[PDB]
Structures are given as structure tokens and as C-alpha cells.
Structure 1
Amino acid sequence: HSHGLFKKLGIPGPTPLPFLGNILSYHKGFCMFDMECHKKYGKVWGFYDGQQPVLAITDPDMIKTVLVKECYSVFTNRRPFGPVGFMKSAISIAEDEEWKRLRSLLSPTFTSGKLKEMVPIIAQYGDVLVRNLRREAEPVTLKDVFGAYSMDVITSTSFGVNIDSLNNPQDPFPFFLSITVFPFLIPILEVLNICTNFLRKSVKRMKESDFLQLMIDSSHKALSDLELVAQSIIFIFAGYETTSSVLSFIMYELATHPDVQQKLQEEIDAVLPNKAPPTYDTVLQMEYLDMVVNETLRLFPIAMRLERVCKKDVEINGMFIPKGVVVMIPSYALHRDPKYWTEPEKFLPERFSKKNKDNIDPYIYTPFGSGPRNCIGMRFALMNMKLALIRVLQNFSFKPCKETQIPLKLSLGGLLQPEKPVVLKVESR
């Protein structure tokens, strides 16, 4: 069918098989597929997820045109996910005009000062972590401890609840993607009644009569109860998973690089002497801390792939793109590209130093994306993580163990998840 598209465009790529397209080459994960295609075909290439044509671009100017220059008019939406039901109205899933409203509706949640009156609330949960951390079983599953914290902070910044997750919490947060081959079955399930339930109303209950309160405020600017919940489901998952997952990845690199973990712990002692309470302005000046979370986001991107659906015919940077093609930016392949990073498989936070910050193109390293559809909780995630990295390193040191996977191997599937959990030996001072 559409498998002759890239042939007619003069665009190279792996020859697709009938119906399946190129999905068979995902047997080592799409990152390995993206990197190998990046080396065999160059700056641009096309392939097929089933019968869906995907155009991969690695040129920075062209990437900037897709994510920024032609976002509103052409590349407004990502690949349509489903079946979801009412979750179609979630901001990270909605399209065009409905998303444009949801973005403007939820933008003021993480402004400059909106995060400033969060630290007094976030700081309290930090101690709860150091208390549950101070346990002396003289490794530790870094994910659960970080997940307990990250759930406690996003459920508190969005709504009013604290949860010492030493006991059981209620947040219940895969291997199913046949649609990517055969997605034409999504409209089948949109009427087959396919989707949350416990949380689909547990959130809905919230009346409180602030993310929750800056929404019940609900002129072409309304918000149903399900809409309230649909945004809450996204914010809770993103605040729990993304934070905790990256925090554990950061700790793995700190344990396997004692010089970096030690030089960072020196940074926290100086700027915050006598283990002073982390404020909103002390985080924003620890420079080496910023480099450490930045270099970890390079080697372990949560996206791995950035994508935009072409909505109408375009010619960008001297190349025509038809409607309905998914334009993909292989962030993982670009973050590991030896053409932009020397020894790219190595953990070296000096890439983001004061002098080396200029050599980085902001359209090759895009851990939060860019443009109007970038990560809306980027600054909340950076602050929530850095507030965590500061207090946990002011008190503890982290060290490998016999139950630690070294070198850490990432699930060769479709998730910035490790094969084995990060279990590090925690030591105290």
C-alpha cells in the first residue's frame, strides 16, 4: 500500500515487508534500530511501523522547523494513542484546538513563582525520605524509595495529601503495541468500550469546597469532571515515574563514578553550608548539579524518540513531506552520536560545563523536547529532582553492590527502564 512512499520520494531506508513494514528490525529495541539506520542512511531516512510511514530527521535546522517553526500550522500533534476513552481529553494526548486550550489552561501551573511556593511543601517530604533512607541494613532498590517520594510530592503539589509510603500507597500505575503494526483497530476499541476506574473517580471525588484548585475554577474555556481527572492522571504519572526513574538513573552513575559523586557532594556542602535547608534559589545555582542531571538525561532520555504527525503538505529545508507521515527525531540516537559527542557512551558531566555548554546544539540534545509541545512540567521536574539529589547526598553516599547490574543494560523494548533495578549500597556519614 503506502509502502512505496519513500521509494517514490527518493528517500532511503530499510525495505519494508508486507503488512509488518520494518517492525521486525525492532528485535533489539528501536534505539538500536534508530542508531543503525542513522549510520547506514545518513541525515534523513524513512521506514514503516506496519503500514505507517515514519520519516526520521537528524538535521538541527530541520528539527527546529518541525518542533518550533511549523508547530501550530503543521506539526501540532504526535502519534494518536488509543484506545483511551475519556483519556482522549488529556493534554498529553489531545490534538490541535483542544490541546491548544488545555495548554493555555494548564500553563500557569509551573510559572517562575508558582514553583517558588512549592519548595516549603516539597522540603518536608525530603526529610521523610532521609528518615526512610537512614535505615541501616548494613543494597537498596533506588526506584521504590524514589517512587515513594515522587508520588508524595506530586500528589501534594497538585492536591492535598501526604503519604509516608513505608506502608502501602494507593497509586497502582505493558508489552502491548500490536496497534503500531495494525492501528486501524483503534477505532474498533473506541466503540468496544476500552480504556482507569479506581482512580477514574478517586480523583473525581476531589471537591475542596494549586493544580486541582486552579481547574475546578471551570465561554469556550470549560472543563468537565472527567477532563479534571484526565489531566490529573497525566500529572500524577509524570510526577511519579519520570522523577523517580531519572533519580535512580542519576544515582547509578553517581555510584559507578565516585569522583563525580564526591565532587557533587562537595558542591552541596559549600553552597548549602551546615546542611542548610534547600531553598528555591540554592538549587538554581549549584552548577555541577545541573551538569550531572543534564549528562544523565543525555545517556538516558525518557523520550528516546520525539515525533510529530504531519497534518498538511510541507516543504521544509528543501524537502517535501506529505500529509499523514510521522516525522521522528531519534533523540537517543542523537544523544549517542559520535559526531556531536566525543566518546558518547561515557558519562562525562563536563560536557555541560560553562565553556562546553556552547558546543551543544539545542536541537540535538532535547531531553524535554522543545517548542509549544515541550515538557510542560520541565522546570517542576528539574526542581523536584534537584531538591531530592541535594538532601539525599548531603547525608548519604551510594556505592555498588553484588546485587547491582554493572554495566546497567536498558530494556531493549520501548521504555527508559533498566533491565534490572538499580540496587545500590547506601552508606551514611
Structure 2
Amino acid sequence: THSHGLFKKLGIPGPTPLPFLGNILSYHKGFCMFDMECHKKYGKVWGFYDGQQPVLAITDPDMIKTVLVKECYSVFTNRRPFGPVGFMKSAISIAEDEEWKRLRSLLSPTFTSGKLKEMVPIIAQYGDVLVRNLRREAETGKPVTLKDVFGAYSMDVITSTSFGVNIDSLNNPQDPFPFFLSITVFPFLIPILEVLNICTNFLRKSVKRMKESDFLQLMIDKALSDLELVAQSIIFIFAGYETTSSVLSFIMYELATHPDVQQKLQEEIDAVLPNKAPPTYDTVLQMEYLDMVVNETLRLFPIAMRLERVCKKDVEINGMFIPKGVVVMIPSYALHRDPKYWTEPEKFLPERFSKKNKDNIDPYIYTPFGSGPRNCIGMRFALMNMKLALIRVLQNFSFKPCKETQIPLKLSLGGLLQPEKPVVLKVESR
């Protein structure tokens, strides 16, 4: 508990840290409730300890703009060190400084407006596998676990949008994937596990055997290793499955508990796409209410909850001294629910993002995809992927609450932003 006097010195409020543990016992209600409580207890700026690690929480939109944008390349370049990783240290999400800058430029032309438009005719296939897999569980009046049929779709998308492998995700899906804590109170142990190779060889040799003799194309086309190829593929595999399915489950819960929004969305889909027209790249972007629903759900459920940057050297941002080594954190979940910015923040209201009202929204308060040079590189792909899925599903089915549907939806009091009970809804055919 030696370094537990930093914020007392700097005159920054926060919860009193216990020795060794710091303030980690306060995570018993989850990161979200802890951040929402501290945002009320200490105001605009406070600090806590993840073990011996000082973490300063900031809410000033100017100070957030400074960290994420103005001083990204200079001071706030990297996220919190995460280990043990092994060869995955070369992943773009985990790499640091110059190595990250080289990876960012190398992987950036994957999600251009042109490369995304090339994927719309490809994504349109598994949307029909998604509907037909749902039409079976709908003609039988059997409630549907959404994350299963969504994850089956989300897995089909990422394997082909990046590589080209086509699999109906109801036969054998070759893609499998607590203790993830303790690292906080035992980071000294991270370099320890850095050597006993505790990092499966499943795609470590299978994806490594991407002989191919797309994102896989533009890579072999400084330079990039074939393993540097494996680690990035795993990263792009991580997001496009779990994030895509979890948000789509979050959307259908809110569309089920708010039937008025679900119908108003179905009316717009039939308008832009008459006769159940196939969704194209440009017709998806025309739908504004679909964008408002996705934006409002991501406000209530920012699947990242927090944004983090490591302060690599002493700085004085927006009139506040911040010492080297301190982790700067932006409580995305708490800011998305801050009543000082959102009227009735717990209520699902897509009209916050109407073009009449989308101007009263600060882009450093609503940050579902981060901000600055190190934002979510797969943002445009993710939004398009989820929107292409919502259109084809709502064009065919309507969703109603079931007997076993968790109303209201508890968030996972544990680590990652998921529901406690899975989202099960009744599916009816139009």
C-alpha cells in the first residue's frame, strides 16, 4: 500500500484503498455500478486503485478530448498492459507505440467505404441463413435464445468477410474461445506467466496454415509477418462475433419491451425496401430511425463500459497535473447514464438521436466506439453488419416478451457487459 497516497498528495478525491487490494472490493457490483456511484460521490474527477495501480477517472469533455485526440500520439498512446499474452502481444489492440502505429496504418484500408461496400453482397447471404434458421424455431412456438442464432450469424460473417470460409453455423463450428482478474492485484505475476507459455494451438497452426495457395488478401499484398497475420485475424475474430451478437440481443430486448419503436422501425424498413427488397450499402445508410435505435441501445449498453489510456510521462492537461504511469479512464457507461446530460437516462428513447436532437449530444460523452486515433477500427463494419442483420430479421419477424424473458434486464454484475439471464423472446412470422 506504499503507492496508495498518490491521489491524497495530488488532492484528488476517491474511495480509500485497502492495502494490496486497493479498491477492487468495490467491483462487487460490477464496473458500471462502481463508476456510476463514484461519478456521484466525487464529481468531475476522482481516482482509485486497481491493486497498486492508480486509475484516474475523468469526465470533463475537454479533458477527454485531450487524452483521446489531442495528446494521443504524444502521451496517451497505449492502453493498460494486459498479460500473459504470448505471441498475441503483436496484436493491434495490445501493441504499443511505434509497433501499434505501423499496425494501424497496415490494417486501416480494410474498413474503407469501398471495402465495406464490397462486403454487402457477401453479408446478404447469411442473413437468409439467419431468417431460415429462425423460421424453424418460429413455426414451432418455441422461444428463441437470441445470442445463439445471432452468434451463429455473427460467426458466419467474420469468417468470410476476412478469409472466405463458408459454414452454416448449426453443424460443427470450428471456433471455440474468474481468473482474468487477480492480474490487477498480481501484475507482478504477469511477467511470470510470460515465460511458461501460458498464453491452444488450434488456429495458431490452422489459421497459420492460411496457405490460400479481402483482409487476408490486403495483408500479404514496413512489412507484416504471417504470424503477425494470425494475431490480427484472432483480434478481428474476437470482435465480429461476441460484440455483434451481444448488441443484437440488446436491441431485440429493447424492441420487444418497447413495441411502439419496433413497429415504427418496421415501417421504415418496408419503405426504403419495398416488397422486402434486399438491403444494399446505400439503402442501409438512408434509414435514420434504424441508426437511432442502434445508437440509443449502444448508449444504454456500451459493451466496453470503459475507455483507458496509459499516461506515459508527466503532463498537465486542461489545468490538472497527471503523473507518469497513471491509467486515465473514461467511464463510458456512467457518462451514457449521467442525468446531467440525458433526460430520463434509464429510459430507452431513440428520439435522443433524431436530427432535431442529435445536436444536443457531446461526442466525448457518448463514446460507444472510443475516440481519436485509437478508436474502434471496426466501427463502420460493425454498424453495417448489425444493421444488415436487423433489416432482414425485422422484415420477416416480430418479437414479443415471453414468460421467461428477464424484465427488467439485469446487467452482468461480473466483468463484461452482458445480461445475467440470456435474452429469450417469442418470434412470430409476418
Q: Give me the TM-score of the superposition, normalised by structure 2.
A: 0.98
The structural deviation recorded for 1:196 is 3.4
Residues 1:406 and 1:128: Cα distance change in structure 2 (over 3 Å): same
Residue aligned with 1:137, SS: helix
Shift of 1:109: 0.1
Please state whether the residue corresponding to 1:53 is helix, strand or coil.
strand
Q: CA deviation at 1:181?
A: 1.5
String of CA shifts for 1:182-241, please: whole Å, max 9, x gaps. Answer: 211101111122103112111111121201111123xxx222222100000000111111
Q: Deviations over 1:97-131 (max 9, x none)?
A: 10100000000000011101110000011111111
Structure 1 residue 66 displacement after superposition: 0.2
Deviations 1:236-277 (A, max 9, x none): 111111111100100110011100000000010001111111
Give per-residue Cα distances to partners, 1:305-348, cap 9 Å, x unaligned. Answer: 10000001100000000100000000000001010001100000
Residue by residue, what CA displacement relative to the aligned partner does 1:260-299 show, whole Å, maximum 9, x if unpaired? Answer: 0000000100011111110000000100000000000000
C-alpha displacement at 1:89, in angstroms? 0.4
Q: Specify the alignment match of 1:342 in structure 2.
A: 343
- Superimposed CA distance per residue, residues 350-371 of structure 1 (whole angstroms, 9 cap, x where no aligned partner): 0000111011000000000010
The verdict on how the C-alpha distance between 1:358 and 1:48 changes in structure 2, with shifts beyond 3 A counting, is same
Contact 2:163 2:215 in 1 (8 A): yes
1:280 is aligned to 281
Shift of 1:2: 1.0
Is 1:3–2:4 an aligned residue pair? Answer: yes
Q: CA RMSD in A?
A: 0.9
Distance 1:350 1:175, change over 3 A: farther
Q: Which residue of 2 aligns with 1:48?
A: 49
1: CA distance between counterparts of 2:30 and 2:385?
30
Cα 1:124–1:372 change in 2 (3 A) is same
Indicate conservation of the 8 Å contact 2:138/2:429, yes or no.
no
Amino-acid identity (%): 100
Q: Equivalent residue of 2:55, what SS?
A: strand
Deviation at 1:168, TM superposition (A): 2.1
Equivalent residue for 2:151?
147
Partner Cα distance (2:165, 2:196) in 1: 35
The more displaced of 203-212 and 325-334 is 203-212
Flag structure 1 segments of 5+ consecutive residues without an equivalent: none
User: What does the per-residue CA deviation read over 1:46-100, in whole Å, with 9 as the maximum and x for residues that have no partner?
Assistant: 0100000000000100000000000000000000111010000000110011010
Take 2:46 and 2:322, find their aligned partners in 1: how far apart are those partners?
12
What is the alpha-carbon distance in structure 2 between the residues aligned to residue 121 and residue 137 of structure 1?
Answer: 25
Cα deviation per residue 1:120-147 (whole Å; 9 max; x = unaligned)? 0000111111111111455100001000
Secondary structure of 2:243 counterpart: helix
* The 10-residue stretch of structure 1 (205-214 or 342-351) with the greater mean CA deviation from structure 2: 205-214
Q: C-alpha displacement at 1:175, in angstroms? A: 4.6
Q: Deviations over 1:367-405 (max 9, x none)?
A: 000100000000000000000000000000011111211
- Matches of 1:171 and 1:136, distance apart in 2: 24
Residue 179 of structure 1 is matched in structure 2 by 183
> How much has 1:174 moved relative to structure 2?
5.0
For 1:232-381, list aligned pairs within 5 A: 232-381=233-382
2-side partners of 1:317 and 1:69: how far apart? 11
- Which stretch has the larger CA shift, 396-405 or 325-334? 396-405
- Point out the more displaced range, 179-188 or 304-313: 179-188
SS where residue 358 of structure 2 aligns? Answer: coil
Structure 2 residue aligned with 1:222: 223
- The DSSP-based 3-state class of the residue aligned with 2:49 is strand
Shift of 1:165: 1.1
Relative distance call for 1:228 and 1:61 in structure 2 (3 A) is same
SS at match of 2:183: helix
CA 137–96 in structure 1, closer or farther in 2 if over 3 Å, else same: same
Alpha-carbon separation, structure 2, partners of 1:316 and 1:162: 49
Structure 1 residues 324 and 244, CA, compared in 2 at 3 Å: closer, same or farther? same
Unaligned ranges ≥5, structure 2: none
For 1:233 and 1:77, how far apart are their aligned partners in 2?
Answer: 20
User: CA separation in 1, counterparts of 2:68 and 2:126?
Assistant: 36
In 2, the alpha carbon distance for the partners of 1:67 and 1:212 equals: 29
- CA separation in 2, counterparts of 1:190 and 1:77? 19
Kindly tell me the number of residue pairs found equivalent between the two proteins: 426
- State the 1:7 CA deviation: 0.4
Rounded Cα–Cα distance in structure 2 between residues aligned with 1:393 and 1:271: 13
Partners of 2:172 and 2:401 lie apart in 1 by: 28
Query: After alignment, is 24-33 or 134-143 more displaced?
Result: 134-143
CA distance in 2, matches of 1:418, 1:163: 28
TM-score (norm 1): 0.98
The answer to whether the 8 A contact 2:137-2:144 is kept is no
